[PDB]
Amino acid sequence: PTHADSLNNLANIKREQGNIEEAVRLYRKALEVFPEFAAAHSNLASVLQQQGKLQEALMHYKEAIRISPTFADAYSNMGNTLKEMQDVQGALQCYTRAIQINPAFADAHSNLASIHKDSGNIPEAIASYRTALKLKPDFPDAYCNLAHCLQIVCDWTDYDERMKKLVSIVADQLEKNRLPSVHPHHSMLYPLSHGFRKAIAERHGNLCLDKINVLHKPPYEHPKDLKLSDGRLRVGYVSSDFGNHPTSHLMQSIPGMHNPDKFEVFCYALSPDDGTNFRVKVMAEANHFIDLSQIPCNGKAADRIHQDGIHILVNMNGYTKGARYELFALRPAPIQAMWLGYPGTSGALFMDYIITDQETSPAEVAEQYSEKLAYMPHTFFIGDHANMFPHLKKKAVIDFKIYDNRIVLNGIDLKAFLDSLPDVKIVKMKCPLNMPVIPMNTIAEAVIEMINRGQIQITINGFSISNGLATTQINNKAATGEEVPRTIIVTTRSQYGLPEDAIVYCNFNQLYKIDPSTLQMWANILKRVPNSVLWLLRFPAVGEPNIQQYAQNMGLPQNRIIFSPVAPKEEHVRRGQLADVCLDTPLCNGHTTGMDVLWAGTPMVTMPGETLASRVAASQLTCLGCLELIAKNRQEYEDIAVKLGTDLEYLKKVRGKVWKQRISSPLFNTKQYTMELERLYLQMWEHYAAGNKPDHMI
Numbered sequence: 001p002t003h004a005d006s007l008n009n010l011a012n013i014k015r016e017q018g019n020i021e022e023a024v025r026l027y028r029k030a031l032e033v034f035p036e037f038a039a040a041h042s043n044l045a046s047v048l049q050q051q052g053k054l055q056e057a058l059m060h061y062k063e064a065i066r067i068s069p070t071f072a073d074a075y076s077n078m079g080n081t082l083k084e085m086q087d088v089q090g091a092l093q094c095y096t097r098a099i100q101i102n103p104a105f106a107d108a109h110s111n112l113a114s115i116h117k118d119s120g121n122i123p124e125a126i127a128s129y130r131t132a133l134k135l136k137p138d139f140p141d142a143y144c145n146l147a148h149c150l151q152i153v154c155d156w157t158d159y160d161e162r163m164k165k166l167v168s169i170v171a172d173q174l175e176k177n178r179l180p181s182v183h184p185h186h187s188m189l190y191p192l193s194h195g196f197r198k199a200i201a202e203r204h205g206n207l208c209l210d211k212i213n214v215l216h217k218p219p220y221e222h223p224k225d226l227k228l229s230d231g232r233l234r235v236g237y238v239s240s241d242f243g244n245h246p247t248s249h250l251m252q253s254i255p256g257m258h259n260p261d262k263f264e265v266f267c268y269a270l271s272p273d274d275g276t277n278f279r280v281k282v283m284a285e286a287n288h289f290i291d292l293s294q295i296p297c298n299g300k301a302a303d304r305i306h307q308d309g310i311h312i313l314v315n316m317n318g319y320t321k322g323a324r325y326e327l328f329a330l331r332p333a334p335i336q337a338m339w340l341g342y343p344g345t346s347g348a349l350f351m352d353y354i355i356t357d358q359e360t361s362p363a364e365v366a367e368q369y370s371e372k373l374a375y376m377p378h379t380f381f382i383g384d385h386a387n388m389f390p391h392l393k394k395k396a397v398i399d400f401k402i403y404d405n406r407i408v409l410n411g412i413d414l415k416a417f418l419d420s421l422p423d424v425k426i427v428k429m430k431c432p433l434n435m436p437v438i439p440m441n442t443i444a445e446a447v448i449e450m451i452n453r454g455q456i457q458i459t460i461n462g463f464s465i466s467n468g469l470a471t472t473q474i475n476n477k478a479a480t481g482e483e484v485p486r487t488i489i490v491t492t493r494s495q496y497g498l499p500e501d502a503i504v505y506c507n508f509n510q511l512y513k514i515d516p517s518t519l520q521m522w523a524n525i526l527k528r529v530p531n532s533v534l535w536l537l538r539f540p541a542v543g544e545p546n547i548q549q550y551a552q553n554m555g556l557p558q559n560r561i562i563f564s565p566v567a568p569k570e571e572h573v574r575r576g577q578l579a580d581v582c583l584d585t586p587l588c589n590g591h592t593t594g595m596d597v598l599w600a601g602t603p604m605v606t607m608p609g610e611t612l613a614s615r616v617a618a619s620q621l622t623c624l625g626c627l628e629l630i631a632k633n634r635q636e637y638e639d640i641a642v643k644l645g646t647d648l649e650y651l652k653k654v655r656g657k658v659w660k661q662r663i664s665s666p667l668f669n670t671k672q673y674t675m676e677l678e679r680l681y682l683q684m685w686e687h688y689a690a691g692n693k694p695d696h697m698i
């Protein structure tokens with residue numbers, strides 16, 4: 001039992017050090033010496049859980065509890081194991097049982113909070129995180145996870161203090177080689193240094209290198225020419241997001257546009273098949289598609305990649321839901337690049353390049369990243385909008401009393417419907433081509449009637465005319481962006497309770513991207529522009545009273561902020577046509593959301609910051625060729641925004657420019673983007689065929 005205790009204690013330190021294999025052997029020696037050692041079973045279980053041996057872990061947790069039925073820590077850790085196996089009901093039964101045994105057990109309250117948050121119950125997660133912090137006031141994980149909950153709902157109580165405390169917690173954990181409590185993915189939201197953001201990511205890279213050392217992989221041997229591959233670069237795209245995920249909504253066309261004379265495309269899915277057209281398309285069009293979700297061991301999965309012969313392995317996840325950086329730590333290919341999925345540095349030495357651009361990541365901030373900058377010539381950002389929403393390439397309007405954004409029609413067959421109608425007026429557009437106007441006739445009245453009654457659709461002259469609010473009832477695959485709508489769709493400001501006679505500023509991001517500064521700039525803009533409203537989403541809904549209160553306190557009258565629900569994907573893109581201007585979030589820009597609003601022809605005002613995440617919208621707008629929409633400070637952001645809301649001719653000009661340039665510019669041109677990505681990939685390959693080290697590409 002004390003032979004046993006020293007084996008157990010050594011093992012605990014071996015684990016803390018990251019010598020996971022060593023820790024396992026010692027816990028087993030501990031149980032060899034002393035079978036009924038509840039703590040040794042529970043500790044062996046925790047390290048088996050870390051290794052992904054979830055059924056073996058569960059078995060040792062239950063042993064721990066059989067030996068000691070009041071071992072609340074075993075139940076708490078078992079609960080985390082069941083949560084990783086997706087058994088949320090089992091996870092709750094264990095957490096709640098741990099809190100029933102010891103109501104003062106802070107870790108259990110924190111684990112429970114975390115499952116409330118994941119379930120979309122932010123108010124209970126907040127309550128449980130605060131219980132945890134009441135029981136254990138020095139609890140970085142609970143404090144930082146709580147700061148993230150409060151961010152999500154725009155709770156800004158003691159914001160400046162909270163911000164200082166996050167920084168000092170991270171400093172303190174960085175000192176003492178502890179895994180920081182701020183997740184790499186959240187680190188852009190807080191006033192940390194670039195070293196702190198890089199340092200946070202560096203340490204999640206480190207923890208992958210520890211997990212794979214149990215496997216004992218010899219360094220893989222990497223092809224040094226294209227002889228085995230018939231003169232083709234073998235490019236492997238690794239993603240958890242091949243399915244209905246933003247990433248697929250950006251890049252699903254890229255695999256099948258690769259030049260097969262020079263490239264051979266491998267898609268490695270880390271997720272199982274969700275049944276969506278997004279997965280179907282990438283499986284159909286990639287030269288090779290591999291479901292690594294069927295190959296859970298990372299050793300055998302990185303093997304599966306080395307025997308494909310990959311030259312460039314592309315990491316589209318970053319520290320996200322379902323990433324397997326273990327695959328990239330084992331370096332199964334000679335060039336490993338960060339692309340598109342994660343808006344930050346991996347902080348890992350085992351990633352060579354980050355595919356970015358000069359506006360997103362200027363050279364002066366190259367040490368903000370662990371990777372070498374690999375510049376795309378325009379933006380690194382891409383969108384599949386031209387393929388997913390071609391019905392938004394053109395629009396028509398109904399003249400209710402001429403506005404481009406009160407009552408809007410969009411459809412593949414819109415030209416044929418318009419031509420069925422008597423007296424349609426064409427307005428030549430103020431672009432650097434034309435907008436059909438339907439006058440207020442019997443036809444026009446029938447459409448507005450269908451909107452007012454909440455009616456799903458009508459028929460005019462044989463054409464299907466759909467209510468834009470009812471797309472999931474007419475064609476659920478059109479609502480998700482999986483199919484192109486086959487009816488003419490009607491979109492109106494009345495459907496969203498927006499004013500027919502005022503400027504609509506929009507921002508369709510999750511609310512966490514808003515901070516006190518940003519909402520103060522927005523309130524400033526609304527006060528300068530009487531009439532005007534700010535159009536936000538219930539993302540989530542429990543964020544709305546906070547926003548509305550802090551805006552009431554900034555002297556902004558009631559009824560100047562209008563909230564809409566989160567919509568299906570194509571409604572969200574289509575309904576951006578109803579806004580005048582999009583006010584981008586400077587803390588963390590719209591990324592996918594920025595592409596969505598530009599596709600609708602809606603100008604976006606942005607203020608690029610330090611972080612990659614704060615500069616993506618300014619990169620999109622530079623590629624689009626709209627430099628007048630990029631602000632160098634907050635006064636300029638407000639002045640640009642107020643000008644677009646008052647100078648109506650300037651508004652018409654700027655909108656006309658976005659409308660034309662979404663087609664003319666490279667921003668939405670997936671073929672051009674794939675060709676530039678191919679040039680940049682052959683540069684990466686040359687530089688290493690000639691046996692040089694990764695370096696900056698400009």
Ligand SMILES: CC(=O)N[C@@H]1[C@@H](O)[C@H](O)[C@@H](CO)S[C@@H]1OP(=O)(O)OP(=O)(O)OC[C@H]1O[C@@H](n2ccc(=O)[nH]c2=O)[C@H](O)[C@@H]1O
Pocket residue numbers: 245246247249250340341342343508509510537565566567568569570572588589590591592593594596613
């Ligand atoms: C910080 C951050 O996560 N940045 C990421 C990028 O850097 C990555 O490159 C992107 C993919 O790899 S994801 C991401 O881009 P973001 O702008 O942050 O969007 P986010 O991740 O919150 O998703 C909102 C979605 O809801 C859809 N959306 C939105 C509103 C609505 O009503 N309906 C709807 O379908 C939108 O169309 C979106 O598809």
